[PDB]
Symmetry: C2
Subunit: 130 residues, 2 copies
């Protein structure tokens, strides 16, 4: 009955937005194992641009989130069919590179939550000082 | 065998420091229930000074932390013997107003972790721009 779910991301400065997305992946089915992949520093910088916390910092925070069952840290930047087989992953959770996952029935959408983020929060502090 | 532990705080902009403290309270004994009390907006502002996130925001984030079993939100600013009886609390976890708790054997120390905080993190961003 147990379904293995994989979610990957940078998870920099984790906030309610990440946590809700993780909750959503974890609850895609009744009985799941959520594996979270955390991207390496070098590849995030090269491909996405700038990361604020190190790999160890971003991984250690994730360790404290209820929905997270296992962490792969670092994780590959791109998911492969081999990777899914290696870790016996049934579905990849995500918010076309992913065409092959949809074709295989292994693509599960999750949504984002705007406005909740660390960035937005210091704005809040500063509006105080006009 | 189960021990009820109570921890209270503001829990504004939750970071690894709060999470480690929560972990520590949760693991004081083998079998525990960790109850977390989150302080109200009005009383935090009046007594401590400024809060960045609302009561609902600070409580909803805490909901996602592994170690948290129950939340009282808002919680009283000061713990009373009546309060402990009401919620069948065995120990209060904390990092002299608390003399009475020590006297009763109900005071459990937990430690802080410096440098890990949201504030410290935007400093990190800004050192980039000299």
């Amino acid at each position: 009955k147990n379904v293995v779910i994989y979610a990957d991301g940078v998870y920099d400065m984790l906030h309610l937005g990440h946590m809700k997305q993780l909750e959503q992946a974890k609850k895609l089915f009744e009985n799941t194992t959520l594996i979270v992949g955390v991207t390496s520093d070098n590849e995030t910088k090269l491909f996405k641009g700038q990361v604020v916390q190190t790999l160890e910092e971003r991984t250690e925070t994730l360790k404290h989130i209820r929905w997270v069952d296992e962490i792969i840290s670092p994780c590959p930047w791109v998911v492969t069919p081999e990777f899914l087989e290696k870790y016996k992953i049934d579905y990849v959770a995500h918010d076309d590179i992913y065409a092959w996952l949809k074709r295989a029935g292994k693509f599960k959408a999750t949504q984002r939550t705007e406005g909740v983020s660390t960035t937005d929060l210091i704005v809040r502090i500063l509006k105080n000082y006009e």
